[PDB]
Design a protein around this ligand. Structure first.
Ligand SMILES: Cc1cc2nc3c(=O)[nH]c(=O)nc-3n(C[C@H](O)[C@H](O)[C@H](O)COP(=O)(O)OP(=O)(O)OC[C@H]3O[C@@H](n4cnc5c(N)ncnc54)[C@H](O)[C@@H]3O)c2cc1C
Ligand SMILES: Cc1cc2nc3c(=O)[nH]c(=O)nc-3n(C[C@H](O)[C@H](O)[C@H](O)COP(=O)(O)OP(=O)(O)OC[C@H]3O[C@@H](n4cnc5c(N)ncnc54)[C@H](O)[C@@H]3O)c2cc1C
Ligand SMILES: NC(=O)C1C=[N+]([C@@H]2O[C@H](COP(=O)(O)OP(=O)(O)OC[C@H]3O[C@@H](n4cnc5c(N)ncnc54)[C@H](OP(=O)(O)O)[C@@H]3O)[C@@H](O)[C@H]2O)C=CC1=O
Ligand SMILES: NC(=O)C1C=[N+]([C@@H]2O[C@H](COP(=O)(O)OP(=O)(O)OC[C@H]3O[C@@H](n4cnc5c(N)ncnc54)[C@H](OP(=O)(O)O)[C@@H]3O)[C@@H](O)[C@H]2O)C=CC1=O
Ligand code: NA
Ligand code: NA
Lengths: 453, 453
């Protein structure tokens, strides 16, 4: 019989794992694989679909690789299956030789400041999900009519949020952005976005191309007070690394240009932390505080509050201070890191359950970083199966049909590969008349109406 | 106040951690450290004392670094304190800002074959502990009068076991080897040691200098049937790595020399596994089986049993198939790996408990590998303390005296730095008349007789 492997989640780490498993079978005598992928949403691809910005179709095109993997007769997809709800980890570990958890980071890190949950104060997780038509975020529906938005954080997601708020909606109309978001963005309500970083430019988590692309926003002025960069030398930057030296150059380039009255603006503020979000019933203003950089002995510089304060009117606050993993019922979890504890990708205390991607490593790295991660986990998984075989300890298992029928019993509204293909064709066809790659079905009800029709 | 850090264990990873903590204090404004080291034995240094072979005084001399660290007034040692017995992890996490577990790997991996626990069949853990006068292994007392010993495994510990069994006892008489072991070795009972590796020479975990040093055994023939190496090319070796290419060369050099009748012998056998250990009431013979190398799809080659069998008379069997961590009461543990699950060195689910060394990484690497490991953990530890401080969440604490008195209440027979220094001076003085670096006190009773007199 082949080995039966379940993968939970369908993002990059899941697909890289699936490819690794099938390639091992393809290159190894007396080794065969069957892969079942269980996904919470009706649609695959995880953040490649729901995270990467709608103005980034080329980077999204890694999806072609995932499609090639899914063409394999040994591969099956079951969407609209929530592990922890419809089926439990213990049930999966008994019906499969091994199970790989590739669930990513489904929630947000909080600021832990007063006023944070006022209407108008949201996470990038919610805002990105909403603009990319993730069905769990359809009702986020932020008011985008106010003149100023504030984005907290200095990572690349912070730039995505700023860029989408200020991009010419005519440009966005040619993308797979959610129709509901395009509608809210069309009136161009936001006149200024302020990106607020707690440490300095040298500590920014941004990468260079992502900073450079802000120049392509037609008519939008990128504003940086030259005082944010004064005293930072080429030597200081080079001492952090190559990426930082390039970043600093690009930031100086923005600082060197005076903004134009009446133009939309993206403003970078460094050494600044949000202190308190204020308003009667919704966000009206934010209190910002100034930090200084201080060594804490860890080999990092820390931001330390100086006490200095200013208040800035604002109508939207988006915290882009990191995604965060969510515990899965039946599996161990590290609350502080939002990861599943593991040894070499094998789940703590488990002989046959594994982790890959952001649930294993934390929310760091580009899509490509998940490839070696998945390979390493898969190598270990296969080693462990082999050790069980040479010791004659492999499980005894029409098992493929039995499992598929059981999944259907637990979730009658599951979405097979075939039914995903229906959604996919529909969404792409919807984009044709107006020259968009696709128009997404933005709620579970709509996805299932098409998928399960 | 300073931060109070407890370190559990006193081997290389513990001392590297201690140095890292104090250096951070020394190089950081508004950061001060007090380090308490709690050790199960009366004596410090872990495997530097009890593991590294008695014919390796130079490598043991890293102890000088540990001594320099212990000279710091901010550093305290408490030996004969067993964490999990005299004090519990929960009690330590409340009395200290952070606790670092550096307990190493205290038990052995088993072969899981019939006859394994017959008298005369032991682990390298027990055998090395016994010959290095580790007080938990004083009664191992193996019979060394029989002509043949068999050592299982192809790691550097396997070479230590073989080398000590066959070294001229006149040479060992000038070392810090346990007197009880020197007594058993003096009659030169063992005429042949057979080192049995399950995979091939290309897969050996030995390193090169360690293989080369076997040539320095005066009068002992290293025996390798040329057929063990036939068909292994320079190209095959180079494809594994530099160390392997050098190893293969050294092994060929041994194979190229015919053994001499009547000489003591060390024999290398590859592609061989122990199947069963036999005898009426003690080890009398071992059944060996032949393996072939087969890909299991993991990117390793696996050994697979061919079924071929031979029986070899043997009176001692030492399994050197890896050390193994032991669970600590109150802390999580991964049974399969024998490690404590952790995220970046922080213990799963804990805000202030950490791991370093072999309990974190598994039993791999030379002494020096623990240095960066400890540094990385300490960097994280200090970061986390700093984050707690900027948030005003640090514990409220004569605390040094209070803790020391509490330890004395729990363990009246604890061994202070001063009392270790007494043991140390006594043992070294004992070695003077016969030109030995020290003569170790080999039981807890003897250690305490001197230490606490
Ligand atoms: C806003 C954003 C933009 C990004 N843009 C880029 C970019 O432009 N370029 C780049 O290289 N990288 C980008 N990244 C990084 C990239 O998205 C990640 O590296 C990658 O997606 C992580 O893959 P993953 O498999 O761990 O998780 P995910 O991609 O998050 O996939 C996890 C999958 O698991 C499913 N799941 C979760 N829980 C369950 C459950 N209980 N049961 C069943 N299924 C479950 C989810 O629905 C999801 O489909 C971006 C990340 C974000 C957050
Ligand atoms: C036989 C042997 C020979 C070796 N020879 C060499 C060599 O020649 N060169 C080289 O570079 N490396 C050598 N090594 C590797 C080296 O010993 C390890 O890399 C290193 O010692 C691991 O350090 P550690 O701190 O993790 O653990 P250890 O050195 O094992 O120290 C752990 C300490 O924790 C204490 N402890 C355990 N449990 C408790 C408890 N519950 N409460 C209080 N204390 C506790 C122990 O008593 C011990 O003192 C050898 C290893 C072995 C096994
Ligand atoms: N094109 C690309 O390569 C992209 C890549 N990503 C990749 O995905 C991950 C996640 O991105 P994301 O921006 O969410 O996270 P990070 O890069 O870690 O940046 C987090 C920032 O948040 C900041 N943060 C965290 N807590 C706070 C508080 N309390 N106040 C203020 N600021 C805070 C953090 O600041 P810090 O460095 O800790 O001082 C980062 O700037 C990260 O590795 C990205 O590079 C994401 C989007 C892309 O477009
Ligand atoms: N001078 C030095 O640098 C020294 C260094 N050490 C270092 O300490 C660690 C531990 O050494 P140790 O020899 O205990 O372990 P390893 O190097 O991992 O070697 C283990 C070997 O055991 C073998 N093993 C494991 N299970 C079995 C079974 N079931 N049957 C037969 N053989 C088995 C294993 O074989 P494998 O590679 O898995 O096929 C290694 O050869 C290792 O990293 C050493 O290099 C130890 C002693 C030294 O002298
Ligand atoms: Na981006
Ligand atoms: Na050695």
């Amino acid at each position: 019989r082949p080995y039966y492997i379940a993968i939970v989640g369908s993002g990059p780490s899941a697909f890289f794992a699936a490819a690794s498993l099938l390639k091992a079978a393809d290159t190894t005598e007396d080794l065969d694989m069957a892969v079942d992928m269980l996904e919470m949403l009706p649609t695959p691809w995880g953040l490649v679909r729901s995270g990467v910005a709608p103005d980034q179709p080329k980077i999204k095109s890694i999806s072609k690789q995932f499609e090639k993997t899914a063409e394999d007769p040994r591969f099956r997809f079951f969407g609209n299956v929530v592990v922890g709800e419809h089926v439990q980890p213990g049930e999966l570990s008994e019906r499969y030789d091994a199970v790989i958890y590739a669930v990513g980071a489904q929630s947000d890190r909080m600021l832990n400041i007063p006023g944070e949950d006022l209407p108008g104060s949201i996470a990038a997780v919610d805002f990105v999900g909403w603009y990319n038509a993730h069905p769990h975020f359809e009702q986020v529906s932020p008011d985008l009519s106010g003149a100023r938005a504030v984005v907290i954080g200095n990572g690349n997601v912070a730039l995505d949020v700023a860029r989408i708020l200020l991009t010419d909606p005519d440009v966005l109309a040619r993308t797979d952005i959610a129709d509901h978001a395009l509608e809210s963005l069309r009136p161009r309500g936001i006149q200024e976005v302020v990106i607020v970083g707690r440490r300095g430019p040298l500590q920014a988590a941004f990468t260079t191309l992502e900073l450079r692309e802000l120049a392509d926003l037609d008519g939008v002025d990128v504003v940086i007070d030259p005082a944010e960069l004064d005293g930072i030398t080429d030597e200081d930057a080079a001492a952090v690394g190559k990426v930082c030296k390039q970043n600093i150059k690009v930031l100086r380039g923005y600082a060197d240009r005076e903004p134009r009255p009446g133009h939309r603006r993206m403003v970078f503020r460094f050494l600044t932390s949000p202190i308190e979000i204020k308003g009667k019933r919704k966000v009206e203003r934010i209190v910002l505080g100034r930090n200084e950089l201080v060594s804490d002995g860890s080999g990092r510089v820390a931001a330390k509050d100086t006490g200095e304060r200013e208040e800035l009117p604002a109508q939207l606050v988006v915290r882009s201070v990191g995604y965060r993993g969510v515990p899965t019922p039946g599996l161990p979890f590290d609350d502080q890191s939002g990861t599943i504890p593991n040894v070499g990708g094998r789940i703590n205390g488990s002989p046959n359950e594994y982790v890959v991607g952001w649930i294993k490593r934390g929310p760091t790295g580009v899509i490509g970083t998940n490839k070696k991660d998945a390979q390493d986990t898969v190598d270990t998984l296969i080693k462990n199966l082999g050790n069980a075989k040479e010791g004659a300890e492999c499980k005894s298992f029409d098992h493929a049909d039995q499992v598929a029928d059981w999944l259907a019993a637990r979730q009658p509204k599951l979405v097979t590969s075939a039914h995903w293909q229906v959604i996919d064709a529909f969404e792409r066809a919807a984009g044709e008349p107006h020259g968009r790659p696709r128009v997404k079905l933005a709620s579970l009800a709509e996805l299932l109406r098409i998928g399960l029709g």
